[PDB]
Amino acid sequence: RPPMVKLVCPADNLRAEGLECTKTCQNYDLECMSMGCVSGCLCPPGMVRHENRCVALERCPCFHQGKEYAPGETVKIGCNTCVCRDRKWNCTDHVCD
Amino acid sequence: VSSQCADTRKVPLDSSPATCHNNIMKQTMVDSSCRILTSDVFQDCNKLVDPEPYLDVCIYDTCSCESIGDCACFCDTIAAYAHVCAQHGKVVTWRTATLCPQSCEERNLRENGYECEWRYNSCAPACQVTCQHPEPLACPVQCVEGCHAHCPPGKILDELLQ
Amino acid sequence: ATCSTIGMAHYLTFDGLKYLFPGECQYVLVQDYCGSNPGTFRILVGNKGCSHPSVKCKKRVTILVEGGEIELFDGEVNVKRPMKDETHFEVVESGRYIILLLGKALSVVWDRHLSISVVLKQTYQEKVCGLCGNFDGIQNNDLTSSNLQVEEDPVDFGNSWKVSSQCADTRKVPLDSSPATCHNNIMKQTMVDSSCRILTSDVFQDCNKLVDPEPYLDVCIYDTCSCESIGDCACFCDTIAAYAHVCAQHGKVVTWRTATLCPQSCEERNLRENGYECEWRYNSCAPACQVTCQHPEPLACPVQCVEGCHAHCPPGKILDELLQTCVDPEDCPVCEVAGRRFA
Amino acid sequence: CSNEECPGECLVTGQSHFKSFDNRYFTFSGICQYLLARDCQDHSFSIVIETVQCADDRDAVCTRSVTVRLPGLHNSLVKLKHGAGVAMDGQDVQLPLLKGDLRIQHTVTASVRLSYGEDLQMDWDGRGRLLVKLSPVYAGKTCGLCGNYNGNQGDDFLTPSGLAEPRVEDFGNAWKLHGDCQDLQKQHSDPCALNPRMTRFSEEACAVLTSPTFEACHRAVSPLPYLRNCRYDVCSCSDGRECLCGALASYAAACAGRGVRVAWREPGRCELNCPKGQVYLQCGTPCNLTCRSLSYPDEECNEACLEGCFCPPGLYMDERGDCV
Amino acid sequence: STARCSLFGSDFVNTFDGSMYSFAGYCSYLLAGGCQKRSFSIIGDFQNGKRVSLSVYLGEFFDIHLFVNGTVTQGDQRVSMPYASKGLYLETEAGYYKLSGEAYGFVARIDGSGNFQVLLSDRYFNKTCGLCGNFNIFAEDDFMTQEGTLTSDPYDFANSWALSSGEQWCERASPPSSSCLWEQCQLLKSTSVFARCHPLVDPEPFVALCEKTLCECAGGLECACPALLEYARTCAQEGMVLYGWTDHSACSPVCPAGMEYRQCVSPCARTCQSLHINEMCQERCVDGCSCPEGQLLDEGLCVESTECPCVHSGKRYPPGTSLSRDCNTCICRNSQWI
Ligand SMILES: *[C@@H]1O[C@H](CO)[C@@H](O[C@@H]2O[C@H](CO)[C@@H](O[C@@H]3O[C@H](CO)[C@@H](O)[C@H](O)[C@@H]3O)[C@H](O)[C@H]2NC(C)=O)[C@H](O)[C@H]1NC(C)=O
Ligand SMILES: *[C@@H]1O[C@H](CO)[C@@H](O)[C@H](O)[C@H]1NC(C)=O
Ligand SMILES: *[C@@H]1O[C@H](CO)[C@@H](O)[C@H](O)[C@H]1NC(C)=O
Ligand SMILES: *[C@@H]1O[C@H](CO)[C@@H](O)[C@H](O)[C@H]1NC(C)=O
Ligand SMILES: *[C@@H]1O[C@H](CO)[C@@H](O)[C@H](O)[C@H]1NC(C)=O
Ligand SMILES: *[C@@H]1O[C@H](CO)[C@@H](O)[C@H](O)[C@H]1NC(C)=O
Ligand SMILES: [Ca+2]
Ligand SMILES: [Ca+2]
Ligand SMILES: [Ca+2]
């Protein structure tokens, strides 16, 4: 189903990232291990997979405890409010009582 | 403080203190008796605070706190856990007519009695104003639980005669 | 007279004899199918898992008056077989108690937890049998087994009134008071005795002149040693409630419940929609039977001092039947044909 | 006293039992590949663990293999397979192995030792038990399942996003490497609520910890956490004969790290049962006793005790496995 | 609504749905009990491929063991019979040993042949998890291994439910490698006695197991009769009970005395040490045995109606055995002191 892109494995030393390495938004920062390239398909390098299909990198929801959170949304945790940008939570600190 | 206290020595045995595990007919109700910390109302607390230490406390001081006609030695732990939940804006209700019941209607103006001015409320915002300190204060609980008087805005509560 | 089950392991005959007999299968409280006459009624008190006074004890009562059963269990009554003589069949939910009227003389009172009382008038004189004696006014002979023999100890006497012959009747307890659970600490034993010495402390001093609290103290010592209570104190308050009920029948109403001693409440069922119309209170003994659009006429309720929570609505706007909210008398049955509620 | 940061250790053992770098203990029991620890600030190394299920039970979990990656040598280096063997980039090799800065060596007690330059020491023996010693240099640059190697144990549930969850399942699920692996639900606490037959034995067996035999070490490390692990292991795993003694040895090794020694091996207990011609002796300071050391006598001899299999003090290890 | 799974014959098993097979193990496999909130378990012990003993487990505190020869224990003790307890009334019946738990809901039997039977309740629909298989009407997916996967080999499915306990450790179970003259199995297909059970159940698997047993025939008529009782009971519980079978070729299922094996015997089993209360016997028909009609049962055996002894203080006395009191004395009539 377009605009899906496929790739083959040159099979020189099996370092190419095949279908075994689908760089989901939740896995982008985490290192990806490659047991060996497998001829498969993947979205463009500038595009990352999502639950349904691959979507812009800057839009995968930030994840707090087992629930979704769209970008720009803020959550208050006891003493401070924090907002997720670039999938990463940013917010100030205030040592309170 | 004082150097003549008979320092507490140690408890060598493991969980289920000597009072537990000597029959294992008890120690079979207590675990199920106060597993209610995850039965029907506390699934929402569990996502915020993990109730392992509170279960451990309940198992303790329940074998070793013998009860006869006074169930207060057990309701207190549940009350503490509910208080901790309430701190995280997550008020809960757990008291029934058959489980640690509490009544505050005894002090309801026996002279007439009909003027039922008192109730029992869970969150019940903590610090109010009367002819004692008619100014805002800094009370860091802000809905202490208990029995509360909620008569209309006008004709505020008194100090001594309640 | 009255036959009742003090606590949940002891029995009190019609002639006033107290004894101990823990069982676990069906028995016979009182019947009349033993005399040289055709019997009428029969009552069985089969209990579940009550051979030990542990908290798990539950009890069931079945009544066979003519052709029906009532199955007093857990919540309320059943009518599993309607009786052809409902002309004098009533059920009343007064205070915390439930009252059943089954005939001119037979009456039953239930706490809903563990206490059952049976009341008979003078008609059934020397015409009954079972675990409640023969109601003849003689205490000595009210211990006869089913085979016309006078036993010696209650344990053997009770086995003869068993229904099913495959129960493994209880053998006996050889030890003295302070059952196995006690007298091994004399630290839990020394708290139980003082804990329910309140039967003579300050409020029951007037009762003690009329009724001696000797048997009830012993009952309290029992079924508190052998009752491991964890978060539920109902195993204890029941004995004191029974003693207070006995006092009440002699016109000596008492109040004993504090905010830290067997507390009780009845405000939960107080119209949560608004609630401000607090129509429920807790009363000393809340006279028993009050008319409504259920039985708009005085009945014969032989307690008249039922303890619990009560409604005290003004002279008008009497209490309703189902929604538990006082309403004006319009909401009475249109007609009594066929004995149907008819709103 | 003078404060000073000292080396940290991350431990993986039992069915699923972790000790983070600081002090935090917990149980995860998830079935996928996970990232155990990474440099996270300079990207010098990475450790990945593969996990499976054992003992045909709901709550029984194991670790099959561990893979280390060292960008220094540019390649996905040694994989530690379920056996004692190791594979360097897909090819099996025979120990010992020497290279520019890597040393992999078979130890006395039938294990493997992987060492890099002056730090990152790893002990792994076959049946799912991994010890990772890390030098103080990596004092604040580490993110993974072992948590940041700081002084506070209260922030070891820190997900890569930046926030710390209160629950263990959510914290664990955040460190997957495959999108297919499912996210486990509530962690089950008591495993032998499903096998009531194995109840008396577990409680009576996992009680030697709170007995005089270990009373010497009762004030070196608190044996509260090592008791529930014993109970869990005995209740859960298929074979209780060796699971019981797979846990006691862990406590004995923990005590040995603080200097306290104990025997804890008596008839009726899982004695080492060393083959003939060798000696079960306690401390022997193995640096000699393998005449490879005889060939090279001036490399190093600096090692503590290992109470492993040894030989009478007139023998050296034979190549084929003898000691005559 | 009530199912029934039974272990019968020699190394045979029947599930709650009908899918049935053979098996021989050694490790006290799990027979019934949900694997989400257990709350109890039924464990059937084996020994050397045989069927020895049955046991239950409530929570983790109460054990009970029943054994096949009528000996009962408490885990470390030796209790008597009937021995009512905290629920779980151990009793006796038309000749078999019964263990009934009504608070939880189940009934287990052990007859003279050692054939185990268990009946569950409806509230365990789609929730039972043991060896008898999941309890749902669909009858083809009843090989759920403990891992949750599905298999086809009976031995692989059954070996995943073994339970070990300390001193007793167990190994993998392997099928016996032993192979093998009248064919009376077609008795289920020829006579009209069983013709009425045909439209409710399919006799084919019973014929298959009958020939499987026929392979062995370490005896004359034992080849088939054990395979026949099960079919009769199965189509009896289905809603209609076969009447007056056993009169042609059966092998007389055995009970100690009386031998009055028959269907539709009231569990009440009127004796003379009874209050003769009627209308309270509302139990379905249960197969078993008794002793003829002119005799009333006693604790050990049954005796003529004219020799029911009197009872006093637990002691038994023959008729005309007048006891003496200090003040009076009188005689033993037919269990009626006068
Ligand atoms: C019904 O079968 C069971 C088991 O098949 C019989 O129980 C067994 O009885 C024998 C006889 O005493 C026990 O042997 C004894 O064991 C003790 C303890 O090990 C030992 O000290 C004695 O010297 C003797 O060897 C055996 O352990 C026991 N097995 C059990 C309880 O599992 C039972 O006797 C049979 N019933 C009848 C009426 O025979
Ligand atoms: C968080 O926000 C502040 C101000 O909005 C910014 O200075 C800081 O760099 C942000 N943090 C990160 C990690 O980008
Ligand atoms: C408790 O008090 C708060 C204060 O506004 C009120 O909103 C709430 O309804 C009260 N709860 C009860 C049960 O009265
Ligand atoms: C109980 O009700 C009676 C009659 O309505 C009343 O006289 C009495 O005062 C009540 N008791 C209490 C404690 O209110
Ligand atoms: C190691 O120490 C010396 C040095 O080689 C050697 O003679 C001795 O045998 C070794 N230790 C033991 C315990 O044998
Ligand atoms: C049994 O329950 C499971 C989960 O609740 C469900 O998926 C399945 O369809 C059920 N089976 C039947 C026959 O109802
Ligand atoms: Ca009398
Ligand atoms: Ca940390
Ligand atoms: Ca099925």
Residue numbers in the entry:
A (entry chain A): 768 to 864
B (entry chain A): 1027 to 1188
C (entry chain B): 865 to 1207
D (entry chain A): 379 to 702
E (entry chain B): 31 to 210, 221 to 378
From the primary publication:
One extracellular protein family that arose through domain replication and gene duplication is the gel-forming mucins, huge glycoproteins that coat and protect the epithelia in the lungs, intestines, and other organs. A remarkable variation on the theme of mucins arose with the evolution of the complex vasculature in the vertebrate lineage. von Willebrand factor (VWF), a glycoprotein responsible for hemostasis, has a similar domain organization and is homologous to mucins in its amino- and carboxyl-terminal regions. We present residue-resolution structures of VWF and MUC2 amino-terminal segment tubules, enabling comparison between them and an analysis of the features that stabilize each one.
Due to furin cleavage during recombinant protein production, we assembled the VWF tubules from the D3 dimer and D1D2 fragments purified separately. The VWF and MUC2 tubules also both display twofold symmetry perpendicular to the helix axis. They differ, however, in that the VWF tubule is a one-start helix, whereas the MUC2 tubule is a two-start helix. The VWF subregion map contained two adjacent beads along the path of the helix at an overall nominal resolution of 3.4 Å, and both beads were of similar resolution. Aside from the furin cleavage region, the remainder of the VWF bridge is highly ordered. The E2 module of a VWF protein molecule arising from one bead makes numerous contacts with the D1 and D2 assemblies from different protein molecules in the neighboring bead. This ternary interaction may stabilize both the bead assembly and the relative orientation of beads. The contact between the bridge and D1 includes a cation–π interaction between Y730 and R202, while the contact between the bridge and D2 includes cation–π interactions between F716 and H460 and between F722 and R442. In the same region, a row of salt bridges is made by the intercalation of residues E714 and D724 from the bridge between R442 and K459 in D2, and another salt bridge was found between Asp720 and Arg505. Further supporting the interaction between beads in VWF, direct D2–D2 contacts are made at the interface between beads (Left).
